[PDB]
Amino acid sequence: VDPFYYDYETVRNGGLIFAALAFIVGLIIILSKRLR
Amino acid sequence: KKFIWNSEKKEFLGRTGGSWFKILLFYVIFYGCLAGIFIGTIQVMLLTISEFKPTYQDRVAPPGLTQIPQSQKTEISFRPNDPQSYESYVVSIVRFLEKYKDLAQKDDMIFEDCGNVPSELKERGEYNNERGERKVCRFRLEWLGNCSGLNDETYGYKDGKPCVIIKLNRVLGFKPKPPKNESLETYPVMKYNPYVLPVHCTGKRDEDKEKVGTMEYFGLGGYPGFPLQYYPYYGKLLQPKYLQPLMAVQFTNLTMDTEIRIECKAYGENIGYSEKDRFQGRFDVKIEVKS
Amino acid sequence: ERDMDELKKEVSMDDHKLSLDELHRKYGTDLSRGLTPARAAEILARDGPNALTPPPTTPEWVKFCRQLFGGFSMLLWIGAILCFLAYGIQAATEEEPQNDNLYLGVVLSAVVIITGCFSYYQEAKSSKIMESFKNMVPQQALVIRNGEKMSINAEEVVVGDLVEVKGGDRIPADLRIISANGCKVDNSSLTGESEPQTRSPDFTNENPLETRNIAFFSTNCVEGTARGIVVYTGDRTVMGRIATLASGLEGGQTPIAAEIEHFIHIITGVAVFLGVSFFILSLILEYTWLEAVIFLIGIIVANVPEGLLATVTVCLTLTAKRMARKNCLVKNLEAVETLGSTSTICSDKTGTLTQNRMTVAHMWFDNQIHEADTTENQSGVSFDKTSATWLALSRIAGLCNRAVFQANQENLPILKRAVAGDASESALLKCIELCCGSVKEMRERYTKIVEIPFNSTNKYQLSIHKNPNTAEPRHLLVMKGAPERILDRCSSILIHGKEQPLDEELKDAFQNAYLELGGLGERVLGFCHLFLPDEQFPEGFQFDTDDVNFPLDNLCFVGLISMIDPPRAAVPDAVGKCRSAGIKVIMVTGDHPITAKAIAKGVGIISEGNETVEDIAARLNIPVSQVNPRDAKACVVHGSDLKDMTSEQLDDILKYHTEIVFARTSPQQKLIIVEGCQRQGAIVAVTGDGVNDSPALKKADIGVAMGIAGSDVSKQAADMILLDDNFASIVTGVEEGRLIFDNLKKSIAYTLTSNIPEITPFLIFIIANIPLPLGTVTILCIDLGTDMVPAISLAYEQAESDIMKRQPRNPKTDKLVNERLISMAYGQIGMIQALGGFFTYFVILAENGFLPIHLLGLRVNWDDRWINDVEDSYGQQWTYEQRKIVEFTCHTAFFVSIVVVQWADLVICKTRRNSVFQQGMKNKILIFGLFEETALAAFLSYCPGMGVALRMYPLKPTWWFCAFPYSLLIFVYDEVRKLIIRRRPGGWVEKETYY
């Protein structure tokens, strides 16, 4: 009922999930034992 | 001196004439195409927003309580005896109120006569060109009690009784909602018109509240607030000469030669506050009549 | 020098006067068997390793302080200190303050911490790799223990140990000579004179330095062999203390430092200029008195590549590691770059181009060519083993020989056993031992009276033996050597047993046989003997080897023996790469010109179609002296001709010939060739293994000492050590050296792009009077996020596809940072990266209510804190913080957009000539950097509290995709530019954009 309200929590958690995924994948690549 | 100019191959600052011409032409065509791509992307973005409706507004919600005269550091200090120490506030008040002059609201194709008492939201329709330009609810300058620039041009500063006209931040498609009297147990005693957004000024500490004096609220119908019959706002494209509701507060009987900080607050469901934004729904003005 | 002869000759006290018995009871060593490994370890643990104590090492925790509180770290600490100081002022002024300055100071301090921690990681890695090479192949010492002779690390030599040194070995420690056979030492580093002083066990002088029975540490043994006993080890030796307290090296201006220090100075100057100019600009634009200095600090930190030192360190250390893994050990780090600039390689034939594994192949006697060496079927050879001439040939091939099989090897095959002697002598041994009989038995029967070994002056081997036959004259002389010299020293030739005068027809057949055997690429040796008359030489005759008591002329030629020596496997492809890389290969061998030419044509030094003057003359049957020398692109220069050659003739031969082969060239003449090549303005790498090569190895730009057969003198005089003695390894090292230039250039070209988008927002802020699109905190975010890890990741990039298909570079033309690199980083890529950020800024402001046109001039009121009536394009009124939220969200989106375009910049910086599709994304560290920078941006934009601490607010989804077009634009632009360069070499596009 609040048109002047954007669900900032949804985008925030979406971006944080992405940040965690990218961080984990980066660690997997740099610490990879079989990616070379 | 060799780097500055060598004439053998006609090199100036490092390269020959043909070199300068070639790099200048490359940079001209490159920067031209770059600025063209920038402008093109800007136009493609412009084709997404509309002329009378912004794609995002949660950054202006809730609106802010603004005060006239606007003051640097929000301090209204002057010497009532000296007519010069308060000329700045008078100039600002006159410049803002001139848009509300009795002569400014002449034509009826723009200005429409709205009720002398606060009424319900006068919904003009939708935000398109189908209904063309829109009507403007007139606001009589006389609705301000003793500060109208009609009988006393000074507005009170001449005899140590200033006036700070309060105003609400214009927000497109905003419908103020006064608090229901059922919930009325927190805010102080005020007149209750279900079509009036209330505003109440007080001190801030146990010292300013005492040294303040006697508040005098002036507004449409004698209600300390804004009448709901002036909202919603339809933007600057549909209502070019829209006049927003005003309200005045006169601080009669203020402690001379003493600075007192007062906070005015607009209550309502749609009106929030913030500890970081000292103007979101409320505001602060410290006044000192040092005569 | 105030450090030598009178001060050193007095610090001396030795035991050269002791007898072998007194020496034995003093040191307690079995003078014929050495000490037991038990006592060796005991003395090693008691006295310490045979090494000199090194200077102190900076603590493992001091680099942290030197980096965290260094040059730019001091600037960031000053900024954070000022922020904390202003927070104290605000905590003392009006009650109910704000903590903006506390968070700004915490931010700056965290920036210093992260920057110093990353730089420390990189520098600690540099230390970890620098140590890995000083002990990769340590210097060895040949000691004798428990009777067995074993080679051990020089640091494990203890006092009393008996060491055995030979020609080319370094003296492991001060020794007392017990036994020696013609041993000569080079006391140049000790007394100054490089004249070889002989060393004998006999006591000759009271002064320890003037005596002849003491070998000194750090000196080298030139010729001979000697056994001694360690009297001083480590720091106790004569030269030990002197050399370590006076051997400080220089501060050599390597081209890497020559370019890096300069470019860093200019970039630091322009950055500090921008910082102060923006400082005064901000102060004029009513900026707060503290945020102006913070903006100056941020500008200085961002516009300066504060990781170029780490990038250079990682590049040089990584490529040094890569070279060491490919059998190229660099002694110093200058060679790491000189290798990439190599243009001429003077290599040897035997030892570097070939495996030096010789096997007898053909013989020439009785005017007939005889193949031999049956395939282990007990058949022997392809001729009768009873031929008289072959008997005389194998007789002098086993008698005049000097190599012997080692202990316990007469119970296994002959082509799989071990030997002791030259490669040629080993092949001559394995031949007659596999097809005639026992060489030890034959050499025992013909007792050797006197012998002349292989000397550089004689240039031939010889031996006189007692003859036990019946139709035998008492003494039989046998000699071998260069076939030409052996033929000139003979009057008769042995034909089927009967000798006959050496006529012209036989000499012509000999020359034709030499051409036949040498055309196959085989080393040929001459053999001859003489039956010394009894009237002139009775039984008890004593042949003088110093006055030529016996005749050396009028000999009798027996035959020619030729051995095969296959070239290395990767040599042909290596010379092919060199030809494809503009590197001139020159063969410098002491072999015969026929064999040298054959081997060169086989491995590709002399390519098909090219002919020497001799080949032209032989093709059109004209005198060689008549042919035009310019008609031959290749040539075979003889050593005797180089001796009678002038500097101008040498320069002529080198300048007007593309394929040069120096045959019969002595190791001393190598320096002449090196000087001639350097005189032509070329970087020369020269291969050396002997002690006579030292001048040529030190004079050359890159001396390559053989890692296996190379003596310690060559290894100590060389700039690089070839671990597998393979020529192809030199070319591989050259490619690795060429890789550092590309990687460093790419990393530099990537680090400079972000400066334009980091400074343009403030410039437009002043010129256009619009709300600031990029703040200080976000500038620091851009620097820490996209400029640290992605810039280092370029150092790990692999070689391109045309790394060896291009031409070498010279220092005075190919600079690290040139005008084209600045134009590309600042004028083309940087501008697009900045435009992307400006675009997303306009998008955010327009979507929130402020159209781009409305933003002109609005900044005056936008930055005002008391004007809360700011009207947008839609006519709405905003407060101060309400609009500041949008401005800071624009800052965050600007940072995100910069990351997005930095993706494309990092990808296009992977290749500067080829396309990214041929190279591929094989770099794992680069992909890691991309993922981590994107994750860091997402975290700094969506983590709770970032809005109230770093003023960074969440980004709406449709805001991440606003910079994609500019990123793709950068990608396609660089791809088409590189495609145009590839399909139009030397064109305008390359001559103006190829950085």
Ligand SMILES: *[C@@H]1O[C@H](CO)[C@@H](O[C@@H]2O[C@H](CO)[C@@H](O[C@@H]3O[C@H](CO[C@H]4O[C@H](CO[C@H]5O[C@H](CO)[C@@H](O)[C@H](O)[C@@H]5O)[C@@H](O)[C@H](O)[C@@H]4O)[C@@H](O)[C@H](O[C@H]4O[C@H](CO)[C@@H](O)[C@H](O)[C@@H]4O)[C@@H]3O)[C@H](O)[C@H]2NC(C)=O)[C@H](O)[C@H]1NC(C)=O
């Ligand atoms: C701000 O707005 C307010 C309204 O919101 C104005 O209100 C005024 O407040 C005062 C204080 O309460 C009232 O009381 C007294 O006013 C006296 C003067 O008025 C007397 O005469 C009037 C009749 O004549 C007046 O009106 C006609 C038009 O009708 C004019 O033509 C004529 O010239 C006169 O102006 C009567 O109607 C009125 O009741 C009075 O009899 C003051 O003299 C009086 O002072 C006494 O009280 C003081 C304490 O307050 C004390 O210090 C004095 O010693 C003395 O004992 C008192 O102020 C006003 O009636 C009321 N209206 C008006 C029109 O003034 C207020 O005026 C305005 N601010 C200013 C600065 O004007």
Ligand SMILES: *[C@@H]1O[C@H](CO)[C@@H](O[C@@H]2O[C@H](CO)[C@@H](O[C@@H]3O[C@H](CO[C@H]4O[C@H](CO)[C@@H](O)[C@H](O)[C@@H]4O)[C@@H](O)[C@H](O[C@H]4O[C@H](CO)[C@@H](O)[C@H](O)[C@@H]4O)[C@@H]3O)[C@H](O)[C@H]2NC(C)=O)[C@H](O)[C@H]1NC(C)=O
């Ligand atoms: C409305 O506003 C006023 C403030 O102005 C408040 O009441 C008083 O108003 C006067 C007038 O401005 C103030 O100033 C002067 O105070 C002097 C002090 O003397 C008396 O007061 C002290 C306490 O301060 C006593 O201890 C002492 O014994 C004295 O009795 C007076 O001498 C002044 O008198 C002069 O002015 C009056 C009218 O202005 C004339 O008629 C006289 O002839 C004389 O010239 C004057 O009173 C005073 O300080 C104010 N008192 C305060 C602030 O406490 C009202 O309180 C305020 N209304 C409300 C509802 O709060």
Ligand SMILES: CCCCCCCCCCCCCCCCCC(=O)OC[C@H](COP(=O)([O-])OCC[N+](C)(C)C)OC(=O)CCCCCCCCCCCCCCCCC
């Ligand atoms: C009004 C405000 C204007 C602000 C302008 C701000 C410009 C900021 C740029 C800063 C970075 C400068 C970095 C220099 C790095 C040099 C590194 C180095 O040693 O390189 C060797 C290289 C040289 O390499 P080389 O020596 O190997 O090659 C030499 C080649 N020949 C012989 C042909 C010359 O250095 C350079 O090329 C120096 C280039 C300097 C360029 C200076 C450009 C100033 C232009 C300003 C434009 C202002 C436009 C205003 C428009 C307003 C419109 C309204």
Ligand SMILES: CCCCCCCCCCCCCCCCCC(=O)OC[C@H](COP(=O)([O-])OCC[N+](C)(C)C)OC(=O)CCCCCCCCCCCCCCCCC
């Ligand atoms: C406005 C619209 C813009 C659209 C832009 C994109 C257009 C094209 C569509 C996709 C392109 C982008 C994805 C490319 C993937 C390429 C993969 C690859 O290995 O290509 C191999 C190929 C090489 O293939 P190859 O090496 O197997 O084959 C070579 C064969 N020979 C040897 C014969 C030549 O190289 C590339 O295409 C490089 C692409 C690099 C793209 C880098 C993008 C940034 C990378 C990471 C950023 C962060 C991502 C975070 C993701 C988080 C997800 C939750």
Ligand SMILES: CCCCCCCCCCCCCCCCCC(=O)OC[C@H](COP(=O)([O-])OCC[N+](C)(C)C)OC(=O)CCCCCCCCCCCCCCCCC
């Ligand atoms: C109606 C049509 C709609 C099309 C929509 C888009 C479809 C996807 C478009 C591109 C994605 C696939 C790109 C493949 C590129 C070549 C890969 C390759 O391995 O070739 C090897 C060849 C190299 O082979 P090689 O011979 O050099 O390597 C030899 C390997 N050995 C030694 C083993 C034999 O690649 C090249 O030479 C590359 C030239 C590239 C020039 C690129 C110019 C344009 C810039 C970017 C391209 C577009 C990016 C996407 C844009 C999207 C826009 C929406």
Ligand SMILES: CC(C)CCC[C@@H](C)[C@H]1CC[C@H]2[C@@H]3CC=C4C[C@@H](O)CC[C@]4(C)[C@H]3CC[C@]12C
């Ligand atoms: C290989 C290259 C070209 C592709 C780069 C990957 C792109 C598609 C990734 C990189 C960062 C990502 C964003 C990270 C965070 C958010 C917040 C979330 O609530 C919506 C999606 C959104 C906006 C993501 C969309 C996908 C995204 C833009």
Ligand SMILES: CC(C)CCC[C@@H](C)[C@H]1CC[C@H]2[C@@H]3CC=C4C[C@@H](O)CC[C@]4(C)[C@H]3CC[C@]12C
């Ligand atoms: C950031 C803003 C204020 C300045 C940007 C101005 C642009 C036009 C500047 C930035 C870097 C500059 C280039 C830097 C170096 C060279 C080499 C010189 O021999 C020819 C001009 C040329 C190619 C410059 C042309 C102008 C240039 C492209």
Ligand SMILES: CC(C)CCC[C@@H](C)[C@H]1CC[C@H]2[C@@H]3CC=C4C[C@@H](O)CC[C@]4(C)[C@H]3CC[C@]12C
């Ligand atoms: C280089 C150019 C020509 C590529 C052509 C495609 C252009 C027109 C496309 C590519 C990516 C697109 C942008 C992607 C995301 C956004 C966010 C949205 O809320 C406004 C439009 C905007 C900004 C788009 C505008 C159109 C756009 C810029």
Ligand SMILES: [Mn+2]
């Ligand atoms: Mn040699």
Ligand code: NA
């Ligand atoms: Na930087």
Ligand code: NA
């Ligand atoms: Na050298």
Ligand code: NA
């Ligand atoms: Na970059």
Ligand code: NA
């Ligand atoms: Na930068």
